[PDB]
Design an enzyme around this catalytic site. Structure first.
Site, PDB file in Angstrom:
ATOM      1  N   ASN A 113       0.832  -1.192   0.000  1.00 48.17           N
ATOM      2  CA  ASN A 113       0.000   0.000   0.000  1.00 48.17           C
ATOM      3  C   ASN A 113       0.870   1.246   0.000  1.00 48.17           C
ATOM      4  O   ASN A 113       1.942   1.277   0.610  1.00 48.17           O
ATOM      5  CB  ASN A 113      -0.936   0.028   1.215  1.00 48.17           C
ATOM      6  CG  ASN A 113      -0.285   0.654   2.438  1.00 48.17           C
ATOM      7  OD1 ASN A 113      -0.307   1.871   2.616  1.00 48.17           O
ATOM      8  ND2 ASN A 113       0.305  -0.177   3.282  1.00 48.17           N
ATOM      9  N   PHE A 117      -1.667   8.426   4.237  1.00 48.49           N
ATOM     10  CA  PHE A 117      -2.435   9.072   5.300  1.00 48.49           C
ATOM     11  C   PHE A 117      -3.707   9.734   4.766  1.00 48.49           C
ATOM     12  O   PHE A 117      -3.984  10.903   5.045  1.00 48.49           O
ATOM     13  CB  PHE A 117      -1.585  10.110   6.041  1.00 48.49           C
ATOM     14  CG  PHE A 117      -0.600   9.532   7.023  1.00 48.49           C
ATOM     15  CD1 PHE A 117      -0.672   8.209   7.429  1.00 48.49           C
ATOM     16  CD2 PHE A 117       0.408  10.331   7.542  1.00 48.49           C
ATOM     17  CE1 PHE A 117       0.244   7.698   8.333  1.00 48.49           C
ATOM     18  CE2 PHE A 117       1.323   9.827   8.441  1.00 48.49           C
ATOM     19  CZ  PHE A 117       1.244   8.511   8.836  1.00 48.49           C
ATOM     20  N   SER A 184       5.428   5.275   8.934  1.00 48.04           N
ATOM     21  CA  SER A 184       4.803   5.135   7.626  1.00 48.04           C
ATOM     22  C   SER A 184       5.861   5.325   6.540  1.00 48.04           C
ATOM     23  O   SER A 184       6.636   6.289   6.602  1.00 48.04           O
ATOM     24  CB  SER A 184       3.679   6.154   7.444  1.00 48.04           C
ATOM     25  OG  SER A 184       3.177   6.110   6.119  1.00 48.04           O
ATOM     26  N   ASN A 186       5.075   5.932   3.398  1.00 46.40           N
ATOM     27  CA  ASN A 186       4.403   6.590   2.287  1.00 46.40           C
ATOM     28  C   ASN A 186       4.159   8.077   2.520  1.00 46.40           C
ATOM     29  O   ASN A 186       3.378   8.687   1.782  1.00 46.40           O
ATOM     30  CB  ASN A 186       3.078   5.883   1.993  1.00 46.40           C
ATOM     31  CG  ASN A 186       3.224   4.375   1.951  1.00 46.40           C
ATOM     32  OD1 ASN A 186       4.172   3.848   1.369  1.00 46.40           O
ATOM     33  ND2 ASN A 186       2.281   3.671   2.566  1.00 46.40           N
ATOM     34  N   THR A 187       4.796   8.672   3.519  1.00 48.54           N
ATOM     35  CA  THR A 187       4.829  10.128   3.664  1.00 48.54           C
ATOM     36  C   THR A 187       6.290  10.547   3.714  1.00 48.54           C
ATOM     37  O   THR A 187       6.976  10.268   4.717  1.00 48.54           O
ATOM     38  CB  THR A 187       4.084  10.591   4.914  1.00 48.54           C
ATOM     39  OG1 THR A 187       2.672  10.535   4.672  1.00 48.54           O
ATOM     40  CG2 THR A 187       4.478  12.015   5.269  1.00 48.54           C
ATOM     41  N   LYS A 238       5.093   3.717  17.353  1.00 48.32           N
ATOM     42  CA  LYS A 238       5.112   2.646  16.363  1.00 48.32           C
ATOM     43  C   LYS A 238       6.347   2.810  15.491  1.00 48.32           C
ATOM     44  O   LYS A 238       6.544   3.866  14.879  1.00 48.32           O
ATOM     45  CB  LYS A 238       3.847   2.664  15.506  1.00 48.32           C
ATOM     46  CG  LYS A 238       3.736   1.487  14.557  1.00 48.32           C
ATOM     47  CD  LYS A 238       2.365   1.421  13.894  1.00 48.32           C
ATOM     48  CE  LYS A 238       2.180   0.092  13.175  1.00 48.32           C
ATOM     49  NZ  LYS A 238       0.914   0.051  12.392  1.00 48.32           N
ATOM     50  N   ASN A 267       5.606  -1.542  11.852  1.00 43.68           N
ATOM     51  CA  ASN A 267       4.900  -1.035  10.682  1.00 43.68           C
ATOM     52  C   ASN A 267       5.326  -1.826   9.444  1.00 43.68           C
ATOM     53  O   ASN A 267       6.124  -2.765   9.519  1.00 43.68           O
ATOM     54  CB  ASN A 267       5.166   0.459  10.500  1.00 43.68           C
ATOM     55  CG  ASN A 267       4.004   1.184   9.845  1.00 43.68           C
ATOM     56  OD1 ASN A 267       3.425   0.701   8.869  1.00 43.68           O
ATOM     57  ND2 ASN A 267       3.658   2.351  10.378  1.00 43.68           N
TER      58      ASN A 267
HETATM   59  C1  LIG Z   1      -3.780  -0.431   3.636  1.00 44.92           C
HETATM   60  C2  LIG Z   1      -2.966  -0.248   4.881  1.00 44.92           C
HETATM   61  C3  LIG Z   1      -3.064   0.946   5.587  1.00 44.92           C
HETATM   62  C4  LIG Z   1      -2.323   1.127   6.749  1.00 44.92           C
HETATM   63  N1  LIG Z   1      -2.411   2.319   7.431  1.00 44.92           N
HETATM   64  C5  LIG Z   1      -1.689   2.508   8.589  1.00 44.92           C
HETATM   65  C6  LIG Z   1      -1.791   3.706   9.284  1.00 44.92           C
HETATM   66  O1  LIG Z   1      -2.531   4.593   8.866  1.00 44.92           O
HETATM   67  N2  LIG Z   1      -1.057   3.897  10.438  1.00 44.92           N
HETATM   68  C7  LIG Z   1      -0.227   2.896  10.899  1.00 44.92           C
HETATM   69  O2  LIG Z   1       0.430   3.057  11.926  1.00 44.92           O
HETATM   70  N3  LIG Z   1      -0.134   1.709  10.210  1.00 44.92           N
HETATM   71  C8  LIG Z   1      -0.858   1.503   9.058  1.00 44.92           C
HETATM   72  N4  LIG Z   1      -0.754   0.308   8.376  1.00 44.92           N
HETATM   73  C9  LIG Z   1       0.166  -0.764   8.894  1.00 44.92           C
HETATM   74  C10 LIG Z   1      -0.631  -1.790   9.693  1.00 44.92           C
HETATM   75  O3  LIG Z   1      -1.274  -1.128  10.764  1.00 44.92           O
HETATM   76  C11 LIG Z   1       0.232  -2.924  10.241  1.00 44.92           C
HETATM   77  O4  LIG Z   1       1.233  -2.380  11.068  1.00 44.92           O
HETATM   78  C12 LIG Z   1       0.868  -3.716   9.108  1.00 44.92           C
HETATM   79  O5  LIG Z   1      -0.079  -3.899   8.073  1.00 44.92           O
HETATM   80  C13 LIG Z   1       1.399  -5.078   9.538  1.00 44.92           C
HETATM   81  O6  LIG Z   1       0.356  -5.887  10.030  1.00 44.92           O
HETATM   82  P1  LIG Z   1      -0.075  -7.225   9.242  1.00 44.92           P
HETATM   83  O7  LIG Z   1       1.143  -7.935   8.699  1.00 44.92           O
HETATM   84  O8  LIG Z   1      -0.836  -8.154  10.156  1.00 44.92           O
HETATM   85  O9  LIG Z   1      -0.958  -6.808   8.092  1.00 44.92           O
HETATM   86  C14 LIG Z   1      -1.484   0.120   7.215  1.00 44.92           C
HETATM   87  C15 LIG Z   1      -1.390  -1.073   6.506  1.00 44.92           C
HETATM   88  C16 LIG Z   1      -2.131  -1.262   5.346  1.00 44.92           C
HETATM   89  C17 LIG Z   1      -2.003  -2.561   4.609  1.00 44.92           C
HETATM   90  O1  LIG Z   2      -1.390   5.578   5.292  1.00 41.96           O
HETATM   91  C1  LIG Z   2      -0.366   4.950   4.811  1.00 41.96           C
HETATM   92  O2  LIG Z   2      -0.032   5.120   3.626  1.00 41.96           O
HETATM   93  C2  LIG Z   2       0.434   4.001   5.677  1.00 41.96           C
HETATM   94  C3  LIG Z   2       0.776   4.353   6.942  1.00 41.96           C
HETATM   95  C4  LIG Z   2       1.498   3.489   7.712  1.00 41.96           C
HETATM   96  O3  LIG Z   2       1.797   3.790   8.824  1.00 41.96           O
HETATM   97  N1  LIG Z   2       1.875   2.289   7.208  1.00 41.96           N
HETATM   98  C5  LIG Z   2       1.541   1.954   5.958  1.00 41.96           C
HETATM   99  O4  LIG Z   2       1.871   0.892   5.509  1.00 41.96           O
HETATM  100  N2  LIG Z   2       0.806   2.824   5.184  1.00 41.96           N
END
Ligand SMILES: Cc1cc2nc3c(=O)[nH]c(=O)nc-3n(C[C@H](O)[C@H](O)[C@H](O)COP(=O)(O)O)c2cc1C
Ligand SMILES: O=C(O)c1cc(=O)[nH]c(=O)[nH]1
Ligand SMILES: Cc1c(Cc2ccc(C(F)(F)F)cc2F)c[nH]c1C(=O)NC1CC1
Length: 375
Positions: A113, A117, A184, A186-187, A238, A267
């Site tokens: 992804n 944000f 993150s 992606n910022t 995080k 993350n």
């Molecule tokens: C589509 C998407 C959006 C995410 N958005 C955030 C976010 O806004 N803030 C954050 O701290 N992590 C974000 N994450 C990271 C997840 O919270 C998590 O840390 C990561 O996906 C690993 O968990 P998993 O392997 O079980 O999926 C995002 C992940 C995905 C896939």
């Molecule tokens: O919003 C996102 O693009 C994002 C945030 C984050 O913390 N981790 C991630 O994988 N995507």
């Protein structure tokens, strides 16, 4: 349950044909109209856990970025989760990066992804959380569920601290804990805030702003903290997995010098180059291939912090055993994201049974005595 049956057929249709982000917003919409299943069962008293005064009825929550705007907190929690981390949010609403920005590879249970944000902004999400907290007062099933808020900065913001402090003054009263997102991918330039001197200044500024919430208030505790704990929100941070070992150790010391309440590990990662479906795409990779890297990162930080900083685990948790390895490596709780995407309505009910069974065959009397056992 019959309700779990039809949702798994819909889920298998969605993952084959439908755009990933469309699938996600459909899930959120079904949650908004409260037509998802409920898990009404009493959770095992032996799988309950805590981080300081935060009492988790069970060890599984939903990670940040799932309900970025808090539009269906109740519904997701009622699937059987003990807590959810909404956000990440920014002071101002913003659209994020260009679509399509979410891609799934079902084969390896992996997600990539580059959302950037996307969220409606702190003011609107704050309204949403307040409405939840009012429903929480009146709903039997929500009375002990914990809601954390992940906070970050707008794309063009230069002073991250200014953004973090704004969100706290807005939404801190309604949050059980605050997650500082410096990981993150992606910022641009966000993960540069993980550098030790920068991180330290961030943590102290966040804690300072949380303390000032209660200091011009005239009302009793009960009416200032409109949350679950009835206390000021704890502070977690995080971290991203793409760090070297001297970065990890110097962060580890800042977290102790700051006396931070916990650490979320981890993350998404940018170092997964072996999924063909993804070899052209931007972003951070989630899912199964992220598991082994996360557990490793947990062990290292549990060690370098001398186990004085509780850990929230994130990264490739799909099974009760996956969860157990996170716990034995040092984590107190577990966050799910990819599991929901690929396993559906069932994720919480299923994983809670698997870890319940596994804790008995291993001979643990309860979950808490498994924390940090690999060491
Ligand atoms: C589509 C998407 C959006 C995410 N958005 C955030 C976010 O806004 N803030 C954050 O701290 N992590 C974000 N994450 C990271 C997840 O919270 C998590 O840390 C990561 O996906 C690993 O968990 P998993 O392997 O079980 O999926 C995002 C992940 C995905 C896939
Ligand atoms: O919003 C996102 O693009 C994002 C945030 C984050 O913390 N981790 C991630 O994988 N995507
Ligand atoms: C697949 C998924 C889910 C589960 C899900 C969604 C829709 C439906 C139904 F069809 F019933 F509407 C059932 C479900 F179980 C939540 N989110 C995502 C997603 O792809 N999120 C993007 C990758 C980051």
């Amino acid at each position: 349950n019959p309700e779990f049956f039809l949702y798994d057929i819909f889920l298998k249709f969605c993952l084959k044909y439908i755009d990933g982000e469309i699938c996600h917003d459909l899930f959120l919409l079904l949650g908004k109209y409260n037509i998802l299943p409920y898990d009404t069962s009493n959770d095992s008293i032996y799988a309950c856990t805590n981080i300081k005064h935060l009492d988790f009825i069970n060890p599984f929550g939903v990670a940040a970025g799932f309900d970025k705007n808090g539009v269906c907190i109740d519904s997701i929690l009622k699937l059987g989760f003990s807590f959810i981390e909404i956000g990440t949010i920014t002071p101002r609403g913003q659209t994020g990066n260009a679509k399509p920005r979410i891609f799934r590879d079902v084969e390896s249970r992996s997600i990539i992804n580059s959302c950037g944000f996307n969220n409606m902004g702190c003011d609107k999400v704050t309204e949403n959380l307040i409405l939840f907290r009012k429903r929480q007062e009146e709903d039997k099933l929500l009375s002990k569920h914990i809601v954390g808020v992940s906070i970050g900065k707008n794309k063009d913001t230069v002073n991250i601290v200014d953004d973090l402090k704004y969100c706290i003054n807005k939404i801190g009263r309604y949050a059980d804990y605050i997650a500082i997102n410096v990981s993150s991918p992606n910022t641009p330039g966000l993960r540069d805030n993980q550098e030790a001197g920068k991180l330290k200044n961030i943590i102290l500024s966040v804690k300072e702003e949380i303390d000032n919430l209660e200091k011009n208030n005239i009302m009793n505790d009960e009416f200032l903290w409109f949350n679950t704990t009835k206390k000021k929100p704890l502070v977690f941070v995080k971290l991203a997995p793409d760090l070297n070992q001297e970065q990890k150790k110097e962060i580890a010391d800042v977290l102790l010098e700051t006396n931070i309440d916990g650490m979320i590990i981890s993350n998404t990662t940018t170092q997964i180059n072996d999924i063909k479906s993804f070899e052209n795409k931007k972003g951070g990779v989630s899912g199964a291939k992220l598991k082994d890297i996360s557990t490793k990162f947990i062990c290292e930080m549990y060690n370098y912090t001398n186990k004085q900083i509780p850990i929230i685990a994130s990264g490739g948790i799909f099974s009760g055993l996956d969860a157990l390895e996170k716990i034995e490596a040092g984590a107190s709780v577990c966050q799910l994201y990819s599991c929901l995407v690929f396993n559906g309505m069932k994720s919480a009910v299923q994983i809670k049974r698997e870890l319940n069974h596994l804790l008995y065959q291993r001979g643990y009397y309860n979950l808490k005595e498994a924390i940090g056992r690999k060491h």
